[PDB]
């Protein structure tokens with residue numbers, strides 16, 4: 001694919017924005033939301049170029065390592081234009097007072113604010129989210145396994161090329177392109193941090209459930 | 219500073235390689251080693267360009283967030299040329315059988331192997347380690363605080379420029395430069411992951427101890 005075809009494919013693959021299911025006229029809400037998003041996550045992952053080329057075992061491993069980071073970056077992206085609040089759903093917009101939960105809440109807000117300051121574009125966001133899917137499990141995986149890693153690194157490389165294409169397209173200098181690429185990728189370290197803190201706070205989709213959702217028939 | 223002056227400064231700032239203190243003729247060893255390295259860590263941090271320009275409070279916060287990542291990347295760097303082992307010290311080279319410890323052990327080995335495959339250069343390593351110091355605490359911090367963040371981001375940007383300079387210097391194409399920059403920075407997400415897993419396994423230098431070591435007289 002060209003760089004522009006990568007962007008188009010990623011933008012069309014975007015999952016829908018789900019609603020919280022509480023009676024409008026009247027933690028479980030957050031858990032219920034995450035349950036429903038996971039199914040659409042699977043469908044999104046299978047449309048990330050190169051992902052379905054992996055073994056089903058490798059797909060499960062990547063989704064198992066990445067799922068909370070992917071939910072968290074989606075949240076931070078939705079919340080960008082809502083200073084001081086997290087848009088868990090269009091009908092569930094909470095501030096820090098409504099949130100060990102407030103510690104994680106404050107980190108998500110700070111990431112949303114950093115996105116705001118950098119003026120993160122939707123095209124960049126979908127590249128970052130695909131990078132999370134491919135990268136988060138790649139250091140925790142046979143000849144076929146060596147081939148699986150090479151492929152993942154080639155796909156990651158093409159997303160890097162795509163991010164740079166977007167920035168050159170927008171008129172950034174070569175220096176500004178590298179600098180913004182680095183700033184975006186360092187935010188992924190903070191998203192990993194939050195995911196780890198969140199996985200600590202949650203003590204989770206099982207391998208078998210993920211495999212059951214990924215191991216589709218035709 | 220020029221890019222080449224950044225590299226020289228960072229290389230000279232490198233801390234010494236400490237030895238384990240056990241009687242050669244005959245977890246505490248790992249803890250003792252980390253205690254001694256922390257003091258040299260402080261001295262190293264104060265020589266990272268731009269770090270001492272921060273408030274003492276901001277320096278402490280950054281070191282508090284980064285210290286285990288910095289110890290871990292140093293370990294992975296030392297261990298690169300020792301497949302299957304971790305060189306905690308020149309006299310303490312352990313394999314995974316000698317190591318919830320083995321889970322973290324295996325992640326460090328995998329990072330060392332990834333460094334090996336990419337042929338990480340010492341000049342790149344010192345850039346990455348400085349990036350960890352400046353980035354790991356920056357999303358968890360007043361007008362002076364806004365000025366502190368701008369400065370940190372400017373220093374981070376200059377290290378990005380330096381990494382690219384090193385890669386262009388080595389003859390990489392512009393495409394290969396961006397791709398390698400991205401590959402290096404994504405490894406920092408895995409180092410953060412390991413640090414979080416390690417901080418979980420350790421349940422640590424206090425704020426006051428760090429401040430006491432950083433709040434030097436003349």
Ligand SMILES: CCN1CC[C@@H](COc2ccc([C@@H]3c4ccc(O)cc4CC4(CC4)N3C(=O)c3ccccc3)cc2)C1
Pocket residue numbers: 027030031033034035037071072074075088099100101102104105198201202204205
């Ligand atoms: C029944 C089985 N399932 C499969 C395993 C399990 C699901 O685990 C969950 C539960 C809740 C969440 C929500 C949630 C929801 C939607 C969203 O888009 C993002 C998030 C983000 C997020 C901080 C991470 N969160 C929290 O509640 C939170 C906590 C403390 C501070 C702030 C926020 C995420 C995952 C239940």
Ligand SMILES: CCN1CC[C@@H](COc2ccc([C@@H]3c4ccc(O)cc4CC4(CC4)N3C(=O)c3ccccc3)cc2)C1
Pocket residue numbers: 245248249251252253255289290292293306317318319320322323416419420422423
């Ligand atoms: C007395 C007060 N101090 C201040 C707080 C506290 C210090 O905490 C420590 C203790 C130990 C370590 C060592 C250590 C040492 C040197 C090195 O260069 C790197 C590391 C890396 C590392 C995995 C992270 N580690 C482990 O033991 C390990 C565990 C499980 C699997 C593999 C390795 C790091 C930090 C004690």
